[PDB]
Amino acid sequence: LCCGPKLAACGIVLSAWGVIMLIMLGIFFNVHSAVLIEDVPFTEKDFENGPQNIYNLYEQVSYNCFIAAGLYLLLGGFSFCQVRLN
Amino acid sequence: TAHSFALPVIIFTTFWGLIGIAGPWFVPKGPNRGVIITMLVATAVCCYLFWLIAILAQLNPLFGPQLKNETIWYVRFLWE
Amino acid sequence: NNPEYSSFFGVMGASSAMVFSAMGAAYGTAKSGTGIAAMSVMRPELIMKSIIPVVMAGIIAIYGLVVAVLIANSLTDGITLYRSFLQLGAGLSVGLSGLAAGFAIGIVGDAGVRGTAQQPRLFVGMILILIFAEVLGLYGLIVALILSTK
Amino acid sequence: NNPEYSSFFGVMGASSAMVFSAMGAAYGTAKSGTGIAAMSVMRPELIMKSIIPVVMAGIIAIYGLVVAVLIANSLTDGITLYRSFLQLGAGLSVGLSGLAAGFAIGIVGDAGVRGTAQQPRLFVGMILILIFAEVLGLYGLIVALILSTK
Amino acid sequence: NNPEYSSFFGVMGASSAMVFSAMGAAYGTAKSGTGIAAMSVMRPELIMKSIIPVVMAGIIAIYGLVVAVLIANSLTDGITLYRSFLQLGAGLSVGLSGLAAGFAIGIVGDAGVRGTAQQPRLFVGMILILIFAEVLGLYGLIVALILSTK
Amino acid sequence: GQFRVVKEPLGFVKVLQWVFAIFAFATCGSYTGELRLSVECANKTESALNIEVEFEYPFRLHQVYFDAPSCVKGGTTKIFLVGDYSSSAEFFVTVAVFAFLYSMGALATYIFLQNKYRENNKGPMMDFLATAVFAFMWLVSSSAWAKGLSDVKMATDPENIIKEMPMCRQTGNTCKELRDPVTSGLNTSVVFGFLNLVLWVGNLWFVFKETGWA
Amino acid sequence: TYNKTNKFTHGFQNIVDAYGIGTYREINPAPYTVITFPFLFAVMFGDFGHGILMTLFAVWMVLRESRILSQKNENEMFSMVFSGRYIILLMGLFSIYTGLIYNDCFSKSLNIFGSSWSVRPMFTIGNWTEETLLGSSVLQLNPAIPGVFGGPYPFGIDPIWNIATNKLTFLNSFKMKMSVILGIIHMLFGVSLSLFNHIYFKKPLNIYFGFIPEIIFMSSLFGYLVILIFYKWTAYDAHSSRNAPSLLIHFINMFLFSYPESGNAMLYSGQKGIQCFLIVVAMLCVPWMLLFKPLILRHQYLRKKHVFDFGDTMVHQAIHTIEYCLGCISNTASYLRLWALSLAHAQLSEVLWTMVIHIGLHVRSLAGGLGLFFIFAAFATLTVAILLIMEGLSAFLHALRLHWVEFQNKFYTGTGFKFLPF
Ligand SMILES: CCCCCCCCCCCCCCCCCC(=O)OC[C@H](COP(=O)([O-])OCC[N+](C)(C)C)OC(=O)CCCCCCCCCCCCCCCCC
Ligand SMILES: CCCCCCCCCCCCCCCCCCCC(=O)O[C@H](COC(=O)CCCCCCCCCCCCCC)COP(=O)(O)OCCN
Ligand SMILES: CCCCCCCCCCCCCCCCCCCC(=O)O[C@H](COC(=O)CCCCCCCCCCCCCC)COP(=O)(O)OCCN
Ligand SMILES: CCCCCCCCCCCCCCCCCCCC(=O)O[C@H](COC(=O)CCCCCCCCCCCCCC)COP(=O)(O)OCCN
Ligand SMILES: CCCCCCCCCCCCCCCCCCCC(=O)O[C@H](COC(=O)CCCCCCCCCCCCCC)COP(=O)(O)OCCN
Ligand SMILES: CCCCCCCCCCCCCCCCCC(=O)OC[C@@H](O)COP(=O)(O)OCC[N+](C)(C)C
Ligand SMILES: CC(C)CCC[C@@H](C)[C@H]1CC[C@H]2[C@@H]3CC=C4C[C@@H](O)CC[C@]4(C)[C@H]3CC[C@]12C
Ligand SMILES: CC(C)CCC[C@@H](C)[C@H]1CC[C@H]2[C@@H]3CC=C4C[C@@H](O)CC[C@]4(C)[C@H]3CC[C@]12C
Ligand SMILES: CC(C)CCC[C@@H](C)[C@H]1CC[C@H]2[C@@H]3CC=C4C[C@@H](O)CC[C@]4(C)[C@H]3CC[C@]12C
Ligand SMILES: CC(C)CCC[C@@H](C)[C@H]1CC[C@H]2[C@@H]3CC=C4C[C@@H](O)CC[C@]4(C)[C@H]3CC[C@]12C
Ligand SMILES: CC(C)CCC[C@@H](C)[C@H]1CC[C@H]2[C@@H]3CC=C4C[C@@H](O)CC[C@]4(C)[C@H]3CC[C@]12C
Ligand SMILES: *[C@@H]1O[C@H](CO)[C@@H](O)[C@H](O)[C@H]1NC(C)=O
């Protein structure tokens, strides 16, 4: 699937940005950072007993971030293969 | 979480003073000695002023942060 | 027990539904009319084919009328203020959407009927634009119905 | 407590969302249409490629219809004045943002379709500007939703 | 406790923040667009360079959207008259500032696109003016952020 | 395989550095402490006769919490431990882990690629750089971890917890202790930290001799 | 005018030359601009993430500079950006620093040292209970009770303000004071450079009348304001919050001589007398500039040796004095542009985050990990389209404007010719 080198360069730079920033976001969520509390998809019931439920939700969002990072890793690999093609 | 205002002030003051005062004398002689020394001194002055303003604005607060009850509940458990 | 003035807004809706749309239609049937006449002097054979914008404008009026009749049938002596406001809003939506659609149809139809005398290939293009204008009135009607039958 | 007249504003929301947007779209469909009719006399081949401004005006009308129906499907009898004010604000935002976007699309699309007859390379340029106009309506829609679905 | 109409003004503020800003942006996106269409016939290579005014006009709209959202997310049912009128003031500030900034950007860009077509050296000059005009809208936004969070 | 290099004095030093700071990692990063207390209020039925809590190695004690008795109406109050010392414990454990990884790499190089290591005495040069860096790291971290262990003993001390407990400030309430954590693991960790400190201090001179600067 | 420009300093020399080539052998603003323009840009573009992106882009341009220099193209915008590759590199570095100071990274703080704000002392020493948390939607925090506020954050703004709804309340004051402080200090540095100019050109008349009145006026009126800002920061605390005066009202009263017996008390003992003395010196600095120099020029060039036209000289000096006196005020006001642009950038980044990637992060199901893909791309492009390119351009041009007008008006003339060799 040959394409213009400019698009491949944009794809690889976006892939690097996504991988780095989403890996950092996943690490920060998994650390249960309070700064990102607003992004955690919790509900009222989660404030019943203790913070363990919110910790689990933090971990779930971190897993989502890592999945996004992996998808962007695949995208960057595709872009690098296209660059090697060109 | 007692952030004493002695280690930060001493450390940053001495660091930026060494960069802005001691730094110029260590710049190797050459065509760019003057511009490099100006860069050193100006960076020291600007960065130290910015950090000093930032730290002093927080010293002696006249009111505390307004935190939602959800984030207050979380912060009680999490933060020190 | 409902306010005696509640029906007022209702009738306004109906009246508006048939006035503004009519006004819009008039503009259409006016502007296109002129264009058609200006075209007929040179290319008479395009008269019938060029009556399309007028028809479009006419359809806009129909929308208005339809909604008006709807409202004009949903009026009752004890019509609640909520339903009266709903009918007024439906009338406003249909009437003013038909007004804007009629203005657009008039302008586009005049321009396209004048052009089709010079470039026949423009005919189809004009038609598309007219539809894109006509649908505007349709949208109003849709919303009107949603408000009127709510 | 939930006055008898609370629904009025909400209704005037839906109508607004459908009316003003339509007006904007009509303008976008009208002005652009004239330009196409002017351009197509000399450059027939660009007539179909140059209908994009009309499509964008229609999309503005679709934004208006979306918000108008989303409001009309939330007008309960005892709608609180707060919710009715929210619906009026959403309708005004979507409708008048769509009106401004319709003005912008009309001017830009007409100028671009007439210029593209001279310099084809302007086409892409025009499209970009049209997008920058279209997003304006989109912005309104966004805010409208944020108000209406609140 | 608080009047049942207290939420009206704030809502209008939000809508105003979206509407007037959009209008401003629209005018810009129109005027600059016209200028580009006039320039691009002789100097096609400058279309991308000369699209900066439109972008700045778009930025104005964004500011309004921001404030609108910032007000549309803060409207509570028991919104006091104090908060309601704070949000109204923020909305008026951002909306009218964006309107004026959009007018200035449109006029200056419509002049400067043609000027840069004539004299390339004016390009940077045009920009040096546009940003000034743009920040006028920004100033409004700033005051809005001061008000709606007072 | 240049296994004889392992048997050399510097090979022995590297092996010891490998096995130690693995002992420290196992003893510190694997620590899990437990505290048990009891309270007999004025009303015996409201007594918290058995309260149990558990904490882990990172010593983020301020997060650790438990529902102590209120001694009034049978209610409970949430109480959190005082302060954390992860700044010291994590620092020490990371230092030990880095030492273990570097020692494993150095042992592999000595066994397989000692010729390249000794080439130009540059391998010894980076060895001396790392030796000085690790000596400074151990010097700071051993003291940091010792102070952290002392403060841990103070804070986790059920006596201090009860001292800060507002229960004893009421009438009749008696708060007493039931268990104490195992302090052998942390003392062993600090002892092994000092052992690693002295090991790297000795390695300084050996690397100096190898690099030819002696 | 010949400056012996270098590869690194070419960007800044062209930047300072755009408003007018400096006269023959006058204090060049290029060496000081090399740092104060990236810094005044970072004060507005303060963001760790956007600073990182800008630094990486500028480093890419620098490393591959030879390739693009060889491979020339006609893209005016790219050529302009590339010519300022070093300017952009320095701007990115200083923006990284300021974003660290602002504790901002894509609109999110860091908390690498630990916040000074503990909520537990509210529950322990304060009256709070879980009931109060349940009953209050937003509540607040107070440092008056002992353990809530454990000193200032060692480096940069405390992270808690990111999650505090009182964020803007504090940040507006902090950034307004920062902008005014930096502006006044920059203008004072400009006036000192004007003194250097006068000394080199051997114009003692300007030194004794001119520079000295200018510096006395500026320092007494506005340097005193910086002193007041710093003193209020050091002195008033949470306990004395109730009677903490507003420096805006105090400055206005100083100008109006409206020291009242009611309202906020004096910042310090003897404020009335000291402020009256400062105001008197400030006004006297006006006649000092206006009347003196024309009279001495007339005396020494029309009474001695005997075209000089006293009326026009007096008019010109009056225009210069009016310009400078109104300029001090209008420039101290204009330097608030730093706070305005910084707050706008911060709020636009915040709204972009919460409107784009809050959608992808606020999803319970694991399938959201796929959504975060597409959403993120939009975020990324937006952060490159609105923030990095447009807000960055605005901040760049406004730092430029601050340097051209507010800073260089104190010492720069710019009435020379560029040295165009053969
Ligand atoms: C991934 C994205 C990361 C972010 C990167 C972008 C950051 C946003 C801000 C960039 C602004 C760039 C402008 C400054 C650089 C030019 C200054 C310089 O050194 O050149 C002296 C320039 C051009 O160089 P010159 O040709 O005069 O060089 C001197 C040559 N002799 C001596 C022979 C005459 O000279 C001037 O005219 C001086 C005044 C410049 C004032 C700048 C006006 C604004 C320009 C806007 C640029 C375009 C917008 C960005 C578009 C990006 C999309 C492609
Ligand atoms: C309250 C906060 C603000 C405070 C700001 C003012 C205080 C800082 C500046 C005070 C003055 C510093 C010293 C002035 C220069 C003295 C000359 C000797 C300097 C030196 O050792 O380097 C020479 C080169 O210097 C040179 O080439 C010139 C060096 C110039 C240094 C000063 C420039 C930075 C000032 C801007 C500050 C930042 C902005 C503030 C908002 C070497 O001698 P040589 O052999 O090179 O011979 C000279 C020409 N070649
Ligand atoms: C992230 C937190 C920190 C942010 C704040 C600090 C930011 C500092 C930014 C300056 C650093 C980058 C300098 C440019 C690097 C590229 C070099 C370009 C070429 C070069 O060597 O330039 C020379 C000019 O001096 C120079 O290039 C100057 C180099 C020495 C500068 C010393 C001052 C640095 C700042 C203070 C110390 C560090 C503080 C932070 C810890 C002369 O060009 P040439 O002769 O090579 O040209 C060859 C053709 N003629
Ligand atoms: C359901 C639908 C909604 C129901 C509610 C609406 C009820 C009906 C009332 C609205 C008006 C209906 C009548 C239509 C007016 C036709 C306008 C024609 C405009 C026109 O061409 O006239 C221009 C003058 O404008 C004018 O003179 C403007 C028109 C005159 C004003 C009309 C109002 C009269 C005042 C009312 C008094 C009572 C108020 C209550 C106390 C002349 O154009 P040019 O300037 O180029 O001339 C140059 C050549 N001569
Ligand atoms: C090129 C650079 C150009 C210059 C740029 C800087 C701007 C200069 C501005 C004018 C000169 C300096 C400022 C003079 C105005 C008074 C300053 C007062 C500062 C202040 O708040 O201090 C408090 C008053 O001090 C006292 O209680 C002591 C008595 C009152 C103050 C006496 C005068 C001190 C300043 C001496 C001149 C410095 C000249 C600097 C250029 C501390 O007092 P507290 O809080 O402990 O007491 C309070 C309960 N009683
Ligand atoms: C294209 C080029 C590449 C671009 C690169 C961009 C990189 C951007 C990545 C980051 C973006 C997201 C920012 C979010 C930052 C918040 C994370 C945070 O707060 O961190 C710290 C938390 O982990 C801990 O804090 P805590 O648990 O609350 O407190 C405990 C803290 N003690 C232990 C120090 C007391
Ligand atoms: C088709 C042209 C002539 C335009 C006129 C449209 C007329 C004939 C038709 C088309 C759509 C129809 C409406 C479609 C839906 C509704 C809502 C439903 O609950 C009852 C009837 C009602 C209100 C219909 C009435 C008649 C109607 C308005
Ligand atoms: C040109 C013509 C064919 C267009 C369509 C006819 C329109 C104008 C009229 C004629 C008869 C009308 C219907 C007659 C009776 C009723 C029942 C009433 O409870 C609701 C409105 C409703 C359903 C009317 C809707 C509008 C209607 C369909
Ligand atoms: C191509 C067709 C479907 C559209 C053109 C005709 C329009 C006017 C008609 C066709 C079907 C109609 C809908 C059918 C049913 C209802 C449900 C009723 O409670 C509100 C009105 C509403 C929502 C009608 C609105 C008007 C409507 C959309
Ligand atoms: C059918 C295709 C061609 C669409 C053409 C017209 C569009 C605008 C019309 C046709 C059918 C309409 C829908 C029919 C029924 C309902 C439910 C009703 O409570 C209100 C709105 C809603 C959801 C309508 C929205 C508008 C609608 C989608
Ligand atoms: C003729 C065509 C092009 C008209 C536009 C397309 C129509 C079919 C679609 C597009 C998006 C749709 C809207 C999307 C969401 C909602 C919200 C829901 O609560 C009521 C229906 C409503 C408001 C829909 C009505 C029909 C709608 C407007
Ligand atoms: C109650 O509240 C006041 C005001 O915040 C506080 O100062 C005081 O210490 C509290 N008293 C208690 C909890 O007894």
UniProtKB/TrEMBL annotation, chain A:
Q: Name one GO molecular function term.
A: RNA endonuclease activity
Q: Which UniProt keywords apply?
A: Membrane, Transmembrane, Transmembrane helix
Family label: Belongs to the RNase K family.
The record describes its membrane topology as:
Multi-pass membrane protein
Organism equals Rattus norvegicus
Q: Which GO terms are recorded in the biological process aspect for this UniProt protein?
A: endosomal lumen acidification; proton transmembrane transport; receptor-mediated endocytosis; receptor-mediated endocytosis of virus by host cell
Where does this polypeptide localize?
Membrane
User: Can you tell me where the transmembrane regions are?
Assistant: 8-29, 61-85
Specify the protein name: Ribonuclease K
Q: What is its main location?
A: membrane
GO cellular component terms, semicolon-separated: membrane
